[PDB]
Amino acid sequence: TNVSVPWGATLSNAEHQLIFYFLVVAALAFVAGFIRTYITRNEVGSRYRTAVSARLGMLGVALLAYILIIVAFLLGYDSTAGGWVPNDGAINIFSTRYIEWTVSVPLLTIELLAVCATLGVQARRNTAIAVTATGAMIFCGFLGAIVIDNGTNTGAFILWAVISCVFWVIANVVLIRAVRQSLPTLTPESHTMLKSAAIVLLAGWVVYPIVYFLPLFGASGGLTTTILITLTVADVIVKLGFSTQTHRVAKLRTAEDVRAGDDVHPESIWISSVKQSDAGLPREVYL
Amino acid sequence: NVSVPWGATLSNAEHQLIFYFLVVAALAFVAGFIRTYITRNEVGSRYRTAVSARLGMLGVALLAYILIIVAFLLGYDSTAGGWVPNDGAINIFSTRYIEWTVSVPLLTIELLAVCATLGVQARRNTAIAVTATGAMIFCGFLGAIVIDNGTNTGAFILWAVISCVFWVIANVVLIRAVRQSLPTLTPESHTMLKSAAIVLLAGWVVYPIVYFLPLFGASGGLTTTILITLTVADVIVKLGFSTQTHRVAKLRTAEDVRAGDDVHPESIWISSVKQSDAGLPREVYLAEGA
Amino acid sequence: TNVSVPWGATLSNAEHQLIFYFLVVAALAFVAGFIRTYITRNEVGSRYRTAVSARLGMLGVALLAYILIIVAFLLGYDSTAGGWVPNDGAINIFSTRYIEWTVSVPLLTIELLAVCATLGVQARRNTAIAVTATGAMIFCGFLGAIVIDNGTNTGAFILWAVISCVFWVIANVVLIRAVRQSLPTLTPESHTMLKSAAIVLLAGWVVYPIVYFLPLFGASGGLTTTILITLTVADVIVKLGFSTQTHRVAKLRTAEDVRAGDDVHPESIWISSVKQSDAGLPREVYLA
Amino acid sequence: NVSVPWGATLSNAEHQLIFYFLVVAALAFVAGFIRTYITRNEVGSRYRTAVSARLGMLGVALLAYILIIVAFLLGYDSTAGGWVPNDGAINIFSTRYIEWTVSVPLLTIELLAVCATLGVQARRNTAIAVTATGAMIFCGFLGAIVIDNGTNTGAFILWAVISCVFWVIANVVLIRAVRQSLPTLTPESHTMLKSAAIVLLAGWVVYPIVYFLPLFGASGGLTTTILITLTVADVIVKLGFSTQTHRVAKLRTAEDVRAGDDVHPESIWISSVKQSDAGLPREVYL
Amino acid sequence: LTNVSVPWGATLSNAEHQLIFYFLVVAALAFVAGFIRTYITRNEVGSRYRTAVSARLGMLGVALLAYILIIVAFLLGYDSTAGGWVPNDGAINIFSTRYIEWTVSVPLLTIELLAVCATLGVQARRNTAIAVTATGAMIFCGFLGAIVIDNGTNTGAFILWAVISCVFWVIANVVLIRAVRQSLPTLTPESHTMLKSAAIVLLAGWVVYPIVYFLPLFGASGGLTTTILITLTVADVIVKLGFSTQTHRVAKLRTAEDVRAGDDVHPESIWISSVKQSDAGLPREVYLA
Ligand SMILES: *C/C=C(C)/C=C/C=C(C)/C=C/C1=C(C)CCCC1(C)C
Ligand SMILES: *C/C=C(C)/C=C/C=C(C)/C=C/C1=C(C)CCCC1(C)C
Ligand SMILES: *C/C=C(C)/C=C/C=C(C)/C=C/C1=C(C)CCCC1(C)C
Ligand SMILES: *C/C=C(C)/C=C/C=C(C)/C=C/C1=C(C)CCCC1(C)C
Ligand SMILES: *C/C=C(C)/C=C/C=C(C)/C=C/C1=C(C)CCCC1(C)C
Ligand SMILES: CCCCCCCC/C=C/CCCCCCCC(=O)O
Known about the structure:
The structure is a homopentamer.
Chain A: H1 13-39, H2 49-74, E1 77-79, E2 84-86, H3 92-115, H4 121-147, H5 154-185, H6 188-204, H7 207-212, H8 221-259, E3 269-271, E4 274-277, E5 281-282, E6 284-285
The structure holds retinal (5 copies) and oleic acid (OLA).
Residues 102, 105-106, 109, 138-139, 142, 162, 165-166, 169, 206, 209-210, 213, 236, 239-240 of chain E line the site of one retinal (RET).
């Protein structure tokens, strides 16, 4: 064995206060995000609405997931005057985060594929692979770090992390391919944003496998604090960073369709205070 | 005697797996509910019953699963690498029946809504399908839970059979109503409705099979299997089926627009392929007003 | 006889499981109903919107009320070797249901009067009487069965049940009159629906006074279970049954107004997959 | 010297009555909130402040009453002697002040919104009415609750008077603003605004009266009366008044449509009598 | 030395405990009323100035929820005794939770002001990024000083990080003031006035917080602790609701102007204090291939 489970380390008051701070700040950030996303939903044509429903879906999940993580944290440690001593439920703080990823991540794939130019079967096939891939990716990490021998077995810990990375690559490929195919068919302005969005998501993803392995280099209140806070900052930045990008895309693509006279939008579309499309109504129709 | 699944002690691995799938399910339903709500106006007023049913069922499922999760947390007491069932452990199974009682009937309504059945033939079908599926569940509940704390092997098997009676009645009514619609629909609609019907009616089989596993003994592993399988079943069927009936309603809505039977204020898309164009109703005067 | 309070009877596990089942199934049924009602709100012209706001209002109340009933139930009984033994809070299970009716019923009256053709003072007067009548009707039953001598006094129990029935009749009259007056001025199709809706509500109402008196024929876990479950089935059927009807009415009346060119509706109106009206916009207007 | 009402032990009959009215109130507000939300677009953009205020106040009232109910359930312990007050029994009365503090000012705004007040005269009135009613409540809170656990008969009466000062200031500001509007309104609008104003300003009297009952002694019966009366008062005033200001906004909206001052995308009705017809704005080119 | 007297160490009278709760809950309810008003009046503003609305609703939602936590922390923070209300371990959380609130609520306040400002392209996106991270850091610093470091007893860190905080504070004030002073020229007289007003309410009020931060240095007392808690609550409510109402009035004026200038169209008439600003208009109907 080399695995020092992070829910074994006792926390100082400073650490316990910092973790809670970032946890709740995260939850509230997601509430603010969810609200913003909901209110700005009709800034996007019916064609790119899957991007919106996915974004709102994932923010809703993240929000609720983080409430559980917060609850688990509050019931996971006991104050002893010698610090905060982990109880049996301390593992749930890490357990709950996997639950989050299991649902939140697949929605992130769907959101990216939605702003991609994939059509018909090529689109539905990609989604199916990306979803099941990312789903499996998380579920594997869960088996290694949590489920199997209370996450103490160094064999399984490393084994399933690798099995996970297999699925990870499958995902990266499917997404990168689907993006690389779209960029040509898009305008210069759209091209740039989709590339940006794809990077923010696929780039950030790297942080997680790195943090997964830190428990191998030992155990400590400081390490455990780092693991918890990093993943929180990671979750917030990726989810809100990426989401904002795919939105800006959907709007650009919507505005383009309006300008190209492919469709009409009942309100004017703006980006950084620069008008993109004008408000228009459909023709009145006789039966 | 019947080996009740809420008698079996769970390992930490098992307790962790059950919770994982339970909460993942609940959150999947949150995501589904939100998606369904946001995409509600992609469907004509004619097929709105399909939407209200889908949102209704996802809302119920969501809340039901919160109860199941709570029951699970209060159903077992930790014992140094093991979780020992308490008196409330039965409620984990009890609560799932409560879910089905409401969630399933809504699934029937949702399918019949996208079907072409018209007038009283339609309203009669719904009435039978609903009461049938309602009774189907309530029966299984009496057998597995209510009667002699679900230990009586007689009642357990008896009411499971009475249940299966109602089950068939439902399958018939639905299959008939679908087989009648498919002819009068287009090729593209025809395919989807058939698909949706299969996902629902096919998946249904899993449940009676899982109901009887308690007869082949009791074990942490079995109990875990029963709980997880039903969760995966619930999620796949409800979200799998729901997505299908939606794609139908949109196709049927787009068709009505193209056929010039109605108008829709936004363009309708499926897999990024345009189906209908946005149109407004003609501006009209009044024969008499203020 | 003599009054055997139903919150005195000990429940078997089978009974305790059945009550909870129906209670929660009810609550969820109301969630589904509330959602459906909300989504289908704009299927009705501004003229008949009072019908919708009332229906959604009552479903919202019912939903929340039943959450309280469920809470009361969970805190009302303690598990023992002898089954589920009533504690002091067991009375609240019955107490809470009265609270529900007090609000949910008056909304049911308003909902029916909304789809009625009553105009001006005749309309506002009817509502005022029906509401206060049904309100008093419930509050009376509450005094008899719960408030007065912890609902053990057989005198008050029967007395106030009668005072209640007085208000009950006043309501039935006001509603029946208001309906019978509308039916003439309505179309054949509307006429039929309003009659149907009125029956479902006014007919079902009978179940409640009947169940009120069962505590006189003794007390048992079986009886208590019957009282609780019957009232739940009653609540669900009446509220959802009736509600669906008044909706079908409002839509028909809305579609008619559109066809008669009296008003316009921005979407096509359907009933059992049969189109009733077509989508229309108002004429664009130039301002002085 | 003052017989605090949270000192009195309650019978079962009393405890059951209080809870009944408390929850019935909360549910009445749920029904009201829902109605208000659904009927929000029956009013022109001009009188929307009336709607946002009404929905705001119903939302507050609803939540406030949930707290009052919770406080009630945690305020008394069942014994051989009935329901005996614990330390938290005061919170039942405490929580109601919290409600008024927010719910009342919104009631002022709602009335001023359907008034014809324009520019500074409007913004000034609101500012005074809000701070006036806010202070009015906060004063009563100091007297009855905060100062010496509301036992000091001096402060109890003192701050009740300071309160009444603010009370009058409010009545004046509102009455003035209404009396100025009634001339510029139609006969039908004139009547409604007067009605609404009475329901609010009239009902207000009940509260100061109930505030002083604790001086004529303490008793389960009195405490029950105080609690139930305030509940009936809250419900009647809030949704009685609210229904009126709504009927006003619709009339004023319909009038603007008929006068060709504005357009409304749906037909407006009152007691089944059509007021305005549905109309769209003219299409605009650029 | 340890001259910092933690406010969560002071025992509270019944009068004080009652006052704190009163203002806490009144605040929460004020935010509920605000959130509702904001949501209902969302479509009084053109798509161009929607970021102003989403930010305001976002911040009111956060404030609302944050205050629920503060209230819960308060109820679990003190135990009633013969000697009044005695602080327990969790009493610090009452102050801890308020920092959490500010961390999110404040940055949204910056975004809301920048949204009604005329900043365009990168100059706009850059300003927001600085203002957000600046205000974020500003709060997080105060948190380290008053709470995290040596349970907020270390007078060194307390004063040190308060200064580091004030650095970020100024950076924010500058970015916002600059962005406002640049907009005022390109705006009308009526808009100019409102934006200036809104900016004052926010930037002016901000001063109260650093002042209250340092009161723990003058000693400790139930009365002081009560003052700290109540003041911050009144501050939060006034700033958030005061400022928010103003930025709204701006967005509407700017929306109405665009309509009158024939730059855009709005489907309903826009009013301010019962004075019409724009008339309802529809976009031209369009036929497609
Ligand atoms: C918003 C939440 C996000 C983006 C979470 C992402 C998580 C991962 C990309 C996790 C990947 C992992 C591996 C590829 C190996 C080790 C185990 C995981 C699950 C951490
Ligand atoms: C989303 C939830 C669904 C589709 C649940 C379905 C449940 C059934 C089809 C249950 C059927 C049963 C029988 C026919 C026999 C044994 C008892 C039941 C209730 C499991
Ligand atoms: C949805 C809930 C409904 C329709 C409840 C109805 C309740 C009644 C009609 C009750 C009537 C009663 C009497 C006329 C006499 C006995 C006491 C009552 C309250 C049960
Ligand atoms: C919906 C709630 C309402 C209208 C509450 C109104 C409360 C008052 C008008 C209270 C006034 C008081 C005085 C003028 C003197 C005594 C103390 C008060 C606060 C009861
Ligand atoms: C609605 C909430 C608001 C506006 C909160 C504002 C808080 C501040 C401006 C805090 C500033 C501080 C300093 C500049 C120094 C001391 C520490 C702080 C965080 C109180
Ligand atoms: C809208 C804010 C809700 C806050 C969450 C509180 C959850 C439930 C608690 C209710 C409070 C109990 C009754 C009042 C006690 C106040 C004690 C005091 O006087 O300080």
